[PDB]
Every structure is written in C-alpha cells, then in structure tokens.
Design a protein around this nucleic acid. Structure first.
Ligand SMILES: Cc1cn([C@H]2C=C[C@@H](COP(=O)(O)OP(=O)(O)OP(=O)(O)O)O2)c(=O)[nH]c1=O
Ligand SMILES: [Mg+2]
Ligand SMILES: [Mg+2]
Lengths: 394, 557
DNA sequence: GTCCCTGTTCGGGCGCCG
DNA sequence: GGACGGCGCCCGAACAGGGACTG
C-alpha cells in the first residue's frame, strides 16, 4: 500500500527535453528498461502524458554492468518537502543501495511525473516513453518513504556495532568506522551480507589564503599584493594595506625595486598571521543552498569555496591532479564536482549549487562521460574574472 | 480500414470548451473534392454525420498533394488546438542518410491515408465537428465529426507516431535484424538478405501492418534503386539530395532572403563551402517579411560563390561501423567554418557549416572549440559515437591557449592539418612586467547624468594626456583610456588599469568584436611586441592610479 | 537601489520531412 | 493560400545576473 505524495503548490511537473546519447548508453538503457518492464517496475506510456525527465547511463569503473541514471533534479525541486560524527571517522565507504527502492509501490497519481524517453540512433524510431511504478532511484522522495523499512533493516547491525556510523543520502549508504582497513572492509562485507533481506574524511584539509615570500619586491609585486589583500579584507577585517600602499606614492615603473620599510614589513607579517585564524562568524543555515565556486588554477590545480552568503566561507579547498601531458580539463572539473559534492553530503547532508567555470555547451557535451555518482547537483555556468583565480592561487 | 488499436485518451485544458467557428467559403472545386472524400470516409465509419445536439464547428479546406492528382482534406483547428491539453512530442529528430549502413536489400513504402486509419478517442470526437458547405442552392450542407485522427489537429502527429511505434513493436521483436526507419508513416526497410527472402519478409511486414489496419498501396512501394526517401535519392553505394533550386530574383525582400538562406542551409549538408554570413546579416533590424533590402557587395559576392558551388556534382556514402569517423574542419573568414565527415579519404559521409556568433568578443580558438562541440553532438545523434578530428590549429597553439585561459576547455582526439588559414592567437599578453617599457596608468570617468566623460593616462616618464568624450559610459571611458595608452606607446608597454571589465575583455585575447572600439584596441595589440596588463583596485590612493584618477575625474565627478 | 554590459531562452520567420 | 508536429538556421525581445556609481 502506497504513500500519497503531492507537488509544491502551484507547480506543474517536469518538462525537460532528453539529450542525445551514445550507442553504448542507448543499448544499455534499452536492455535495462526491458528487464525493468518484465518485472513491473516501469510501464510504457504515450504522448498524452506531458511530462519528461532526461535519462542516461554510466558504466562504473571496471564493472561490466551499466547503471541507469535519471536526472530528477527538476522533479526534486518541485516535490513537496544529520549525524555530525560522520565527518570524523577514520574510514568511510559508500554503498549503492538504490536497488531496495524497487520493492515499494509509488502513488498512482504521482507516476505520470516520472516519465522519461529512450532516444534512438539517427532517429530511426520515435522516442519510447516510460513511467515508474515503484520508488525511483535518484528521486528525493524515495529515501523519505523508504526510511522506516531502512531503519528496520539496520537496527540489529547498529546494535551490534554502535561504533559504526551509517547515514543515508538518497541512493547511498555512507558507512564510517575507526578500524584498520582490513577489519573495516570485513565489517563492510558483514553489512552487505546483512543487506540481503574508500573515503577518509579525517584527512580533508583547508586551503588558506597565502601570501608570497620575497627578498626583493618590485612596484608590480607590491601592487599585486595590495590588490590581493584589499580583496581578502572582505573575508578578514584584520587585513590592512596602509603602509604597503604608502610605499607606492608617486608614479613609478612596474619593475622599480622597492625596499620594504619597518612599518610595511610589520603590516605584512601581521596580515600573514591574520590569514591563519579561521573565518569568524559563519553559521550553516539548512534552509538555504550551499554555493560552490570553482576556479581553474592551471597545471591540474583547482580551487573551491563552499559558502552560503558571499565571503562567509564554510569551507575552502583544492583538488590537484598531477601535471598533464594528456590532461582533460572537463574530466578534471567533473572529478572536482563529484569530490566536492561528496564532502558536502558528508559534512552537511546537502548538495551545493555549483558555479562552473566552463562554457554551458562544452560541459553539456562531455560531462556524462566522466560521471560516476548516483546523484547530480544543480549547477550554473559563469565567466570567472581571473582576479579571483589570482586571489585563491596556491 | 480502421486500426483495432486502443485509442489514446485526451482532454481539453481545464475550464475550456469546444470551438464554435463559422465555416468559411471554399471554391467549388474544393467543395467537390471534399464531398467525394467525405461521403467515402462516412461509408467507412471514419466520420459520422452529427445533428444539432453537437454545438461545435471549425472550418475545413483542402489542398493538392505531392501527387498532384489526389486531394488532402485539412481542418484549421487553431482554436481547438489552443484549447487542447499538452502532449510530449516523441519525434526527437530527423533521420539522416549518412547514418544508414550498407544493406543487401532495401524497400521504401508509405501507408495509405495513414491518419484516417487510427481511431480518435470517443470522448473527444465531438470537438472535431465540421461542416461541408452547400454545393448547390438545391442541396444543403452536411455536418460531420471525426472518428479518426484529423489533419490540422495538434495532437495528431504525436498520437500517430506513438501508435505506429506500438504497431511495429511486435514485428521488430520477431525480426530484430531487419531495420525499419519509421518517419511518420514512411518506412525504409533494410535487410542483409538476398532479394527473394527480403521480398518475402516485406510481405510479412505488409500483412503485419494490414492486420493493424494500415494499408501499403503498391503505388508507393519502391522496389528498385534509386529510392526516393526523406528528400534524398538512395543509390546502392551513394546518396544525393534532390536538386536545390535557388531563386533568381532581382529585387530581394526579407522573405526572399529567408528562402535563400534556408535552401543554402539545407544544401550545406552535402555541398562543402556554403556561406551565409553576409546574406544573414542582411536581415538585421528588418521590419517585416515584405521589406525589400538591397544586397550589399559582400552579400552579392557570397551568393555568387554559393551559386558556383551548387553547380557541382556531389554525393554522400553510407556508414561503416567498423571504421573510424573523421571530421575535418576548414576556416573561412567572419567566424565561418565548414566541415567534412568521412571514413575513407575523398568519400564524404556528409558535410556542414558552423557560423554562430557567441558573445560580444571572441577569437578563433573559441570559435573552433564550439564548432568541435557542435560536430560532436551531431555525430552522437547520427552515428552514436564521437569522431576523430583534423583541425587547422597547431598543437602548440592549443597548448598555449589552454594554459593562458582561465576556463575549462577541451577538444577530443585530434590531429593538425596543414590547410590554411591556420587558427592562431594574434597576440599574447606578458606574464611579468617588461623591463624597459614605459609604464602607463590609465583611467576613465563618466557622469551618468550628462554622459560626458574623460579618458586618459599618466606615465612614469612624465607624460600626461586627457581626452574628453560625449555620450559615453564608465566602461567605455575605461576602454578608451586603454586605447589611448596603446596609441601613444612604443612597441613595448606596461599598462595599469583599475577596471576589471576592461581587463576581463582584453585578457581573453579576442580577435573579433562587435564593438568598433574593441576592434581598434585589438588592432593596436597586434601591432605591439610586448604588452603587460596589471590591475589595481580603484579609489585606494595606489601609485600612478591616483594621479590619473584625479586627472580624469576633474570636470566629470 | 540606477545605469551598463553580457549571457541565455524563447518565439517568430524561413528551409526540409511527413 | 491557409492546418499540424519534428529538426535546422538566424534575429530580436525579454529576461537574469554582476560590477560600478551618488552623496
Ligand atoms: C505531408 C503532410 C502529412 N500530414 C500527415 C498526415 C498524413 C501523414 C502522412 O502523410 P502522407 O503519406 O503524405 O498522407 P496520407 O494521409 O498517408 O495519404 P497518402 O499517403 O495515401 O497519399 O502525415 C499532415 O498532416 N500534413 C502534411 O502536410
Ligand atoms: Mg501515406
Ligand atoms: Mg577607473
């Protein structure tokens, strides 16, 4: 028996056009949907259902199976409406328990809102439309509705291990412990056996604003430094640029060498210490979105900030692959986005809205060739001013 | 006959009612055509006489078909269409001959009176009420409703496409290795069978369709090459487009231009080198379809080159999945590009053109990256995979740009092709300030009320200049200051600006802009040997920024 | 807030197909 | 002539941001 679910008042369902898929993905989706239909989990529908949500597939790393992935971001936006100790465990593994959802029916009046359309190569046939009969993977309501059965299945494992932390975010179980990695993997297999019925969050580090060290300073150097500190004073009111700026009175050449006074040297060491302290007065508000910004720093380095109001950063970090003879910017940006989403889910149990430093078209052309998660965060695209790139540079 | 398939339930939009619209006057010829069609359809139960219990009506007319003998009955359902529920369209695109694979045997066939074989939902039938006007003074006019899909209703294309997919599903499951391209009711059928066994399978298919109420009249059953399909001619090893006729008018209106541009875009799929930049620019700010625009000389020449290109013979080939897909890109001016997709050297699968202007300011590497993106999603639609590229850009140029550019940008497996015009960066900003180059501190100010402003610079060697401007903006004064520093500097210059607007533009290394003033700047930057551009926060007393700020604020702030 | 400048979306012509 | 849906192209209108102003 089903649980009624409604939409947020005054909101119609999703009407997103399906995007083109490669042959691999189409073949996988067609076989997966065929099986899903033999089992009653989805049903064919026609064009009198006016709703649509895109669909694709990911081939997991060295797994010979594919996984369907519905992009339910709009539907989740439109559907009616956290263990702090998880961020501290020595090791955390992430299980894909979306399968469970196929055991629970879905309120009939809701089913039409989960429509999706398989496309065809070279448009040989019209698209072929389906809708859901059970809890769909990647839908905000699937974990909400299955929560009670989930708690029931987990009660004994949590009793026999109260030192293990289990958290559920939509299609995913996060399991954390303080075990040697062999014993941790053994406990994880215990949990996967019971469910027939590697992260290390304590090593994530903050990337602080950092100032150059020099024995000889030019007008150019000091001008760049004053601009960087002027910017950083909006995050740290301790910062001051009076004396350093005083060194620049007049109209000097950019390469003139400037000797630093005692006052300016003091100011610089003070500012250098102020940037050590953490950002004061920043409290997480759950009823607002996490904003993630990423800046490409070049040579495989990327920097990111998670905040909710401008200059009030909840976290700042970097992702750094090794320098690239055959480096792929879009693949790296996708990896950065998945890593950051993982961290935000673990810490605050919520995904950020990403501002991506890439063209809309480039991203949409390629990002699904590197996606490996079961959720998809919201994003928008920006044309970053290389100033901020210089600001957070390492 | 009428398909025994289940109907598709449909509904009006909430709080809405059926149309009540007067039949208009039709010519006598169309009234005879309609009369014959209607009494025949009535005998077959496709339309039913209605009485005065039905309050609705909507106008009806008729046009000749492709076959100029036969008529086509149409209904202006624009009102009912407004008042009808939404559908999700299921036709996601248009099949393309370059995506077809070589086949031993081929058949093209068409369904007869396709729409009129698919039942319409009973609850909705009353809204389709129409009236055939009196052909006589002595004969009155008959009123009917539809029991099958009518032409002119907004729900018919999708309902028919869906019904056809359902009807063909059993045959496909049973015959997975026979390929049926299904464009509304056109069927291309390909098999790897000898002609006899193939014809037997085609008879199976015809009877399968007939069981579901769809006839395949022999008149449209093509059995020998060349096949006429989707606007093309399909020969056993090559395809072509059915000929393009460009108009030859002497006066040209907007509508004439749109026709010309449309046919050229159609032609570029297999003709290499089509250009529409100038012809298209001709449409800017035009009033309406009737406005006569006179051809520029640039558009004149463009059209001449296109006409020549069209006088040539050209064809495509079919797809071999066991070979790579290769796209080769060629530049033309004005942000225009053509491409050829092929597998063996001089046998194109297809061709195309990319010309879209994205953004106020851009350069040729950006444009090439977006041409690559367009071709990649086109390839995924038509062949389901990404091609290998051959681009007129050196690996060092790409490397440099990808280093210097702050955005994520990427291009799949590719190889340098030495066919000019090569794509290059036309200048490069320094990363460090330049020893021996004079240092300019530039700034602009503008009064938002009167729109008067000043641009100018001071240098570390004592030069000072201020230029006054009328009807300008802050952003524009900043750009003018940079232009001035470039005009008055040597081959090597350090420039310091307070304006992150101007810095963000100039830093992305544009070679084209819709702004004249940015074009003039770009020209200067190409003339230089070394340029270095630093930034400082405005209004903080820093360095030479202060002097020039006080100079340009004088009579404006 | 306002003015500027720049990006995306959508709708309106046309091409082509049925 | 003229009705419908699909994709393509191109242009302009109506938005949505983000940065810099006035006293
Ligand atoms: C060409 C065309 C078509 N249609 C609809 C209706 C029939 C299907 C198929 O078109 P068709 O094969 O040429 O017409 P059809 O009704 O089948 O008549 P015949 O094929 O028997 O001549 O698309 C339409 O609504 N407007 C059009 O202009
Ligand atoms: Mg037909
Ligand atoms: Mg300024």
């Amino acid at each position: 028996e089903t649980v009624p679910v409604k939409l947020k008042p005054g909101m119609d369902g999703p009407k997103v056009k399906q995007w083109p898929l490669t042959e691999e993905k189409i073949k996988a989706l067609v076989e997966i949907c065929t099986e899903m239909e033999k089992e009653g989990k989805i049903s064919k529908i026609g064009p009198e259902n006016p709703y649509n949500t895109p669909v694709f597939a990911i081939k997991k790393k060295d797994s010979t199976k594919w996984r369907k992935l519905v992009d339910f971001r709009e539907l989740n936006k439109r559907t009616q409406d956290h263990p702090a100790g998880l961020k501290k465990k020595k090791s955390v593994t992430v299980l894909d328990v979306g399968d469970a959802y196929f055991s629970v029916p879905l309120d009939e009046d809701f089913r039409k809102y989960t429509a999706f359309t398989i496309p065809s190569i070279n448009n040989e046939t019209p698209g072929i439309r389906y809708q859901y009969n059970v809890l769909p993977q990647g839908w905000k309501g699937s974990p909400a509705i299955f929560q009670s059965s989930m708690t029931k299945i987990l009660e004994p494992f949590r009793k026999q291990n109260p030192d293990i932390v289990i958290y559920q975010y939509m299609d995913d179980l996060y399991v954390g412990s303080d075990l040697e990695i062999g014993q941790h993997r053994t406990k994880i297999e215990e949990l996967r056996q019971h469910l027939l019925r590697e992260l290390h969050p304590d090593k994530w580090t903050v990337q602080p604003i950092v100032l150059p060290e020099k024995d000889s300073w030019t007008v150019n150097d000091i001008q760049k430094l004053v601009g960087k500190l002027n910017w950083a004073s909006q995050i740290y009111p301790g910062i001051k640029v009076r004396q350093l700026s005083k060194l620049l009175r007049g109209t000097k050449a950019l390469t003139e060498v400037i000797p630093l006074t005692e006052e300016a040297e003091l100011e610089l060491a003070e500012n250098r210490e102020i940037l050590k302290e953490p950002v004061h007065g920043v409290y997480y508000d759950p009823s607002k979105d996490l904003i993630a910004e990423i800046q490409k720093q070049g040579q495989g380095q990327w920097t990111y900030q998670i905040y909710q109001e401008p200059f009030k950063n909840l976290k700042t970090g970097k992702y750094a692959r090794m320098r690239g003879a055959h480096t792929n910017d879009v693949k790296q940006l996708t990896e950065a986005v998945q890593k950051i989403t993982t961290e935000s889910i673990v810490i605050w149990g919520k995904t950020p809205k990403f501002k991506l430093p890439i063209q809309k078209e480039t991203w949409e052309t390629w990002w699904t060739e590197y996606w490996q998660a079961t959720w998809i965060p919201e994003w928008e695209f920006v044309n970053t001013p290389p100033l901020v790139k210089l600001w957070y540079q390492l | 006959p009428i398909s025994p398939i289940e109907t598709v339930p449909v509904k009006l939009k909430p709080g809405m009612d059926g149309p009540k619209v007067k039949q208009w006057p039709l010519t006598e010829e169309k009234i005879k055509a309609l009369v014959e069609i209607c009494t025949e359809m009535e005998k077959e139960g496709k339309i039913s006489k209605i009485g005065p219990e039905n309050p609705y009506n909507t106008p009806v007319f008729a046009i000749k078909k492709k076959d100029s003998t036969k008529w086509r009955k149409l209904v202006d359902f624009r009102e009912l269409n407004k008042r009808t529920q939404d559908f999700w369209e299921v036709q996601l695109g248009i099949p393309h001959p370059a995506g077809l694979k070589k086949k031993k045997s081929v058949t093209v066939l068409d369904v007869g009176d396709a729409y009129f074989s698919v039942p319409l939902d009973e609850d909705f039938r009353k809204y389709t009420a129409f009236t055939i006007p009196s052909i006589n003074n002595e004969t009155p006019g008959i009123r009917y409703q539809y029991n099958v899909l009518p032409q002119g209703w907004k729900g018919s294309p999708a309902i028919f496409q869906s019904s056809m997919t359902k009807i063909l599903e059993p045959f496909r499951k049973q015959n997975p290795d026979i390929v049926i391209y299904q464009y509304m009711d056109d069927l291309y059928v390909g098999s790897d069978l000898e002609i006899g066994q193939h014809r037997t399978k085609i008879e199976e298919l015809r009877q399968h369709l007939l069981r579901w109420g769809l006839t395949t009249p022999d008149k449209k059953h093509q059995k020998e090459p060349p096949f006429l399909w989707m606007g093309y001619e399909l020969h056993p090893d090559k395809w072509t487009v059915q000929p393009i006729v460009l108009p030859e008018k002497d006066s040209w209106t907007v509508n004439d231009i749109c026709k010309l541009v449309g046919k050229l875009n159609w032609a570029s799929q297999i003709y290499p080198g089509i250009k529409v930049r100038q012809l298209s620019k001709l449409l800017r700010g035009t009033k309406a379809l009737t406005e006569v625009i006179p051809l520029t000389e640039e558009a004149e020449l463009e059209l001449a080159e296109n006409r020549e290109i069209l006088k040539e013979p050209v064809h495509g080939v079919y797809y071999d999945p066991s070979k790579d897909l290769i796209a080769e890109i060629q530049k033309q001016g004005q942000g225009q590009w053509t491409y050829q997709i092929y597998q063996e050297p001089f046998k194109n699968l297809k061709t195309g053109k990319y010309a879209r202007m994205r953004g106020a300011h851009t350069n040729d590497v950006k444009q090439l990256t977006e041409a690559v993106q367009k071709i990649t999603t086109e390839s995924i639609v038509i062949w389901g995979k990404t091609p290998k590229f051959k681009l007129p850009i050196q690996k060092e140029t790409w490397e440099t740009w990808w280093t210097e550019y702050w955005q994520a940008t990427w291009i799949p497996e590719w190889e340098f092709v030495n066919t000019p015009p090569l794509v290059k960066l036309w200048y490069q900003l320094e990363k460090e300030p330049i020893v021996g180059a004079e240092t300019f501190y530039v700034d602009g100010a503008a009064n938002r009320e009167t729109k008067l402003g000043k641009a100018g610079y001071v240098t570390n060697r004592g030069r000072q200049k201020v230029v006054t401007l009328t009807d300008t903006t802050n952003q524009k004064t900043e750009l003018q200051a940079i232009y001035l520093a470039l005009q008055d500097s040597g081959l090597e210059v350090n420039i310091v600006t307070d304006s992150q607007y101007a810095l963000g533009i100039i830093q992305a290394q544009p070679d084209q802009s819709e702004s004249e003033l940015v074009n003039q700047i770009i020209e200067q930057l190409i003339k230089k040997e070394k340029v270095y551009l630093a930034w400082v926060p405005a209004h903080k007393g820093i360095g030479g920024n202060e002097q020039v700020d006080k100079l340009v604020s004088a009579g404006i702030r």
